[PDB]
Amino acid sequence: GDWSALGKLLDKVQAYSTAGGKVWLSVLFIFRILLLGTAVESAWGDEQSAFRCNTQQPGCENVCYDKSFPISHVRFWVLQIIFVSVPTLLYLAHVFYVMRKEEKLNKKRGGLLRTYIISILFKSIFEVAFLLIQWYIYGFSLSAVYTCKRDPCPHQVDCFLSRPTEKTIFIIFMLVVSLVSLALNIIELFYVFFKG
Amino acid sequence: GDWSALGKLLDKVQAYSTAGGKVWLSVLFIFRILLLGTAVESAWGDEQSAFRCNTQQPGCENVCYDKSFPISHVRFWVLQIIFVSVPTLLYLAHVFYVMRKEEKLNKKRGGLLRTYIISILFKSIFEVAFLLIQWYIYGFSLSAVYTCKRDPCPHQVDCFLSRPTEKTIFIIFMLVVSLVSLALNIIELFYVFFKG
Amino acid sequence: GDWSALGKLLDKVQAYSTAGGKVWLSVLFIFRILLLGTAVESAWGDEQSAFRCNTQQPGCENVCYDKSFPISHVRFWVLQIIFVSVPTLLYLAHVFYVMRKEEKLNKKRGGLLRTYIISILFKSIFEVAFLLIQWYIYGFSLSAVYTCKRDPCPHQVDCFLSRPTEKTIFIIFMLVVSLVSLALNIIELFYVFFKG
Amino acid sequence: GDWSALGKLLDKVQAYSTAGGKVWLSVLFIFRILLLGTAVESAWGDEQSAFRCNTQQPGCENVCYDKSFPISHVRFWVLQIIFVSVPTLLYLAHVFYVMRKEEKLNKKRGGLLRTYIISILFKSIFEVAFLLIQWYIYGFSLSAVYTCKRDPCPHQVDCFLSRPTEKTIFIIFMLVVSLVSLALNIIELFYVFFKG
Amino acid sequence: GDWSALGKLLDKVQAYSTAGGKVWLSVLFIFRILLLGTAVESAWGDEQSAFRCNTQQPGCENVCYDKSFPISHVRFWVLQIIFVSVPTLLYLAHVFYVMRKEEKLNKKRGGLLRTYIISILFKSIFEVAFLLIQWYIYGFSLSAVYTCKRDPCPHQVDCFLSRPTEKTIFIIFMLVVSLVSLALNIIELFYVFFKG
Amino acid sequence: GDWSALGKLLDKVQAYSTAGGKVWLSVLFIFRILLLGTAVESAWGDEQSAFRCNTQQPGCENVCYDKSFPISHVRFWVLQIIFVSVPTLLYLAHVFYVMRKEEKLNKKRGGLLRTYIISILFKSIFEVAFLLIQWYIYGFSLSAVYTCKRDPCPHQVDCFLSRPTEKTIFIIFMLVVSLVSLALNIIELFYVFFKG
Numbered sequence A, B, C, D, E, F: 001g002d003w004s005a006l007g008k009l010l011d012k013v014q015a016y017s018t019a020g021g022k023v024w025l026s027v028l029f030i031f032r033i034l035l036l037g038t039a040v041e042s043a044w045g046d047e048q049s050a051f052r053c054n055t056q057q058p059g060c061e062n063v064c065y066d067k068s069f070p071i072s073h074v075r076f077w078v079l080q081i082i083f084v085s086v087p088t089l090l091y092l093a094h095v096f097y098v099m100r101k102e103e104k105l106n107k108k109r110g111g112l113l114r115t116y117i118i119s120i121l122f123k124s125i126f127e128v129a130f131l132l133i134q135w136y137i138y139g140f141s142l143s144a145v146y147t148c149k150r151d152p153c154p155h156q157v158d159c160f161l162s163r164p165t166e167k168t169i170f171i172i173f174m175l176v177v178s179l180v181s182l183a184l185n186i187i188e189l190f191y192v193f194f195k196g
């Protein structure tokens, strides 16, 4: 019967949100965790052990894998999902201590609205900034043959990627998820400002 | 003794369903999870490391595995089981907030029936649409010898698959499960419309 | 103190069973799960990576492993243990809803006996049918040298199996478990019919 | 506060045991599980992939590993620990139903002593029978060089084992554990018979 | 309802801290655990099996990997996160016993402030000392080609690293986390001394 | 609210200990488990698959790894941590039954002090005995080149170890932990004897 203290903590955090934002934003978080943790994490398993190059030079497969992939795609999407969830965990931990100082005062407007807007504003800056770095570094597809011009390799060599079509399907799936997540946070910002 | 609040939430969600649909649709969900997570997930383990081709050309096994399998079968069935379960989780989260706004009103018809029909209708569209893509791309069997005509391979080569008979048994098992699941949702749509 | 509602659900399911069938049939289920999940699952680990053949032909080890093993033994025993446990989970979910419709009627013979006999009858049909398929396809032992006559292999080749003696010990262990499980369900059918 | 129903079930099972047998027999069970599950299970990891033989014949390493090891040592000790724990789980499940038929009779000598002696007698028969099979098949040490005379190998070959000294240390550790466990069950049989 | 004894233990430990140090220091601990346990732990997987050298000498890849990496980066960051968390667990276990001796005295200033300052002072000494060892041994980047002059290698050889650019991104991420963590503990020391 | 029966069992076990031994001995147990289970367990992963020797003789790497390492270092430290924790689990299980026989006597000095001293005395004998075996067999460092003179190897060969410097850092970390743990148990023996 000690679960009624959890119903008060969920009510204070979701006090300024709309009725349809509590539903579509929480199920989209579970969609992001299960898809990234089960399906897309194992396609990127043999990303280096199946990368091959057409050369005899020792040391040319180490430096040509590293020029193609400066950071992996599944470790760029894990860093992305933490930065967008930190302003929610920071604001949820802030309400818990505010409700504690006042609970031990009754037994013995304008403050919690400003900190709600700054947390929603930073979840949208982090979503746009991580989409522009990927558009600049990689793009939104993958080709099968790479052409490498590093050292110690002589002139130019041809190198071949591992599963370049299955990975392109999951790059476009994670683009639509982050564009729907960005559009639901802008609706949250518009409803608070245009109300009062 | 705090488990009697769970009996009220299960009663509201299953208010418009028949007596025999609550049984056959929930045990078929557990049948889908245990079969996919234990038996069929490990047959697809060495799908690329045991794919061989009859050539000396460097880079011909990378591009001929990718032409045969644009997406794996076990990652197409994980994406399928999430899309069919999202309209159930969206409707279950909608009833929880509707029962909350009314509970804090009594202590201090036509709305929940329309949203039930749209959730059942989308679980049947997602089952038919995922069956037509697999019929167009793959079929419903697998052969042992593949013939590949990509580049950099010269003319045509012969490539050999890993366990093509054991995988054909599990392709037909997952076809019958999705055809029984589609037939139980059409009976649900017919009982609601022909009642009132 | 909310565990006394579980004692009522266990009493209704086991109302038509004998006194000694509640003990010997539940410990035999745990014996089947722990033996299959710990001991026999890891002997079948390198079943393909240690299969060798005496040839130089590319593609002859792929097609001669697949002719020998159309389905693995540990994935045939996982499919077997689900089919025999589905009529128990279907009948246990049926009693839970029958006790719910009557509980909300008292606060605001001939039906549950017919569905008990049909569930016990289907656990014995599924045990006999899975034993006859294995007797027809495989047998109840394994030999060390296999002789293969598929294509692209020339004439006939010799192929060698991985651990053929340790696997034969566990084939006979899982045969005696399914013959004791079949004999305890026939005693259950004989006691219900010859009582009344 | 619903944990006081567990204190009654533990008191009925341990009613005929001595004061010092409840302590030394339960901690020795945890010693057997943690040692077998953590330390000895990973020494037997590369038991086949590091077995080598001094030959060029294809198929001679498959048949000479199998002649040396008809069953592995870590899968013979998992089968041993289940057979000795089954008479304890069968007797513990028997007391739970006997206390149930009598509890629903008071709210609406000579029987449980005979079944206690038969369960202790079978834990000692299973400990002696598993020690005599290992003395006949293997012994209680391991040598480094094996000499194999099977087919298709020509005449006799030399084969070399993986970690034969570290495995000999753990064979003697599991011998002393099963000899102390056998001696504590004979003291239990002597105290019940010589009391009354 | 037995969770109200946890609210008293959390209040005594955080009695001398500021209002904004309870929030920013606890979420930064979770940021350190999830980033180190999911993203950076798997980039360091094939650190030795993909290290290559341009030589034919047997034994030159063993001694040139060991000269480059005297201790791995992911095992130096696990040792770092335990040493900084030990003074928090030592002080939290000290308050629990102090509240116990006084609770069994009421039912049948200057002591807990000195031990709080010494625990905060040791979390800052351990953060600075682990940053100076890494600056002396490694630096804060990684290059792609290493030049090795050990024995048995003849003269000098060239050796090539595995993913030297992706690892450099995560070295700088874990530097900023430990510099923000060091700056939040110095603010804690300044607020206690300048208050009273 | 059923957690107040755990506060009585913890009070009886720690009745003869000092105030500062309850803190420093329990956090040092958690330091031993997390360090051994996370950091040092994975450095010893490729201990045999990266051991190389400068020979062409078949069977010389099997017998020269086994002469160098008669038992691994991480399996000698798991056996060590169980033997030192068995006298604590034996004494904790002894107090639980002594408090049971007396609880069912009140509702329907000199005994528990002798058994406390014998349990502390055996935790110090097991710590000294495991340190002397390692000093005799191995030492407290590891060198990079080993010289082997077994059979079937001709004359003498050179063999090379895997990570001999990172392992030497963790050998000295586990030496200081067992010397601090031995010094805290001797202080416990001195305080009981010199009190009364």
Ligand SMILES: CCCCCCCCCCCCCC
Binding pocket: A005, A006, A009, A092, A093, A096, E010, E026
């Ligand atoms: C009675 C309130 C229960 C609170 C449960 C939710 C925890 C909120 C996050 C953790 C805050 C405290 C960290 C120590």
Ligand SMILES: CCCCCCCCCCCCCC
Binding pocket: A003, A004, A006, A007, A010
């Ligand atoms: C009165 C009930 C309080 C609200 C409980 C909500 C539970 C949220 C935490 C568990 C979420 C796990 C996914 C469903």
Ligand SMILES: CCCCCCCCCCCCCC
Binding pocket: A037, A038, B033
């Ligand atoms: C019984 C309901 C379970 C709902 C699905 C949860 C699946 C979690 C799997 C995550 C780990 C995947 C490992 C392959």
Ligand SMILES: CCCCCCCCCCCCCC
Binding pocket: A070, A071, A133, A137, E165, E169
């Ligand atoms: C060596 C050439 C310059 C490196 C370019 C790659 C930079 C990638 C930056 C990715 C940062 C992602 C986390 C913010």
Ligand SMILES: CCCCCCCCCCCCCC
Binding pocket: A033, A036, A037, A041, A078, A081, A082, A085, A086, A089, E030, E031, E034, E038
């Ligand atoms: C490769 C496995 C992916 C697992 C995803 C982990 C993401 C964790 C999200 C945590 C959200 C809270 C951040 C403070």
Ligand SMILES: CCCCCCCCCCCCCC
Binding pocket: A086, A087, A090, A091, A094, A115, A118, A119, A122, E023
């Ligand atoms: C001051 C406590 C409440 C904080 C509200 C959330 C603020 C969001 C800050 C996000 C900054 C992210 C930096 C990594």
Ligand SMILES: CCCCCCCCCCCCCC
Binding pocket: A165, A168, A169, A172, A173, A176
């Ligand atoms: C090389 C051809 C690649 C074809 C890309 C197909 C991508 C389909 C992804 C579907 C995304 C829709 C999300 C709702």
Ligand SMILES: CCCCCCCCCCCCCC
Binding pocket: A140, A141, A172, A176, A179, A180, A183
């Ligand atoms: C090769 C790149 C193809 C990109 C096509 C997909 C663009 C996404 C448009 C739909 C986004 C939906 C936002 C709500």
Ligand SMILES: CCCCCCCCCCCCCC
Binding pocket: A010, A026, B005, B006, B009, B093, B096
């Ligand atoms: C008292 C009601 C308990 C509700 C438990 C079921 C949770 C329903 C899904 C989670 C909804 C709340 C998400 C924060």
Ligand SMILES: CCCCCCCCCCCCCC
Binding pocket: B003, B004, B006, B007, B010
């Ligand atoms: C009054 C009881 C409420 C209904 C409880 C149903 C439990 C459903 C959640 C757990 C399902 C796990 C598989 C059985």
Ligand SMILES: CCCCCCCCCCCCCC
Binding pocket: A165, A169, B070, B071, B133, B137
């Ligand atoms: C490069 C040739 C065209 C690619 C054909 C493969 C398309 C596969 C589409 C699978 C989509 C499955 C998720 C909807």
Ligand SMILES: CCCCCCCCCCCCCC
Binding pocket: A030, A031, A034, A038, B033, B036, B037, B041, B078, B081, B082, B085, B086, B089
């Ligand atoms: C390869 C392991 C398969 C595990 C299956 C995971 C499926 C998860 C289903 C989740 C249903 C809820 C979706 C919102």
Ligand SMILES: CCCCCCCCCCCCCC
Binding pocket: A023, B086, B087, B090, B091, B094, B115, B118, B119, B122
């Ligand atoms: C509005 C809240 C209730 C939603 C009911 C379920 C609607 C189903 C929508 C499914 C759309 C799936 C898109 C991926």
Ligand SMILES: CCCCCCCCCCCCCC
Binding pocket: B165, B168, B169, B172, B173, B176
């Ligand atoms: C190459 C021959 C393949 C034979 C296919 C056999 C498929 C049997 C599957 C049984 C499915 C029945 C589900 C109830």
Ligand SMILES: CCCCCCCCCCCCCC
Binding pocket: B140, B141, B172, B176, B179, B180, B183
């Ligand atoms: C090679 C493809 C063979 C397909 C045969 C199986 C067809 C499935 C018919 C039975 C479906 C049952 C639906 C209830």
Ligand SMILES: CCCCCCCCCCCCCC
Binding pocket: B010, B026, C005, C006, C009, C093, C096
């Ligand atoms: C009060 C009754 C508790 C029932 C617990 C056992 C659950 C029975 C199986 C699950 C049936 C409900 C599925 C949603």
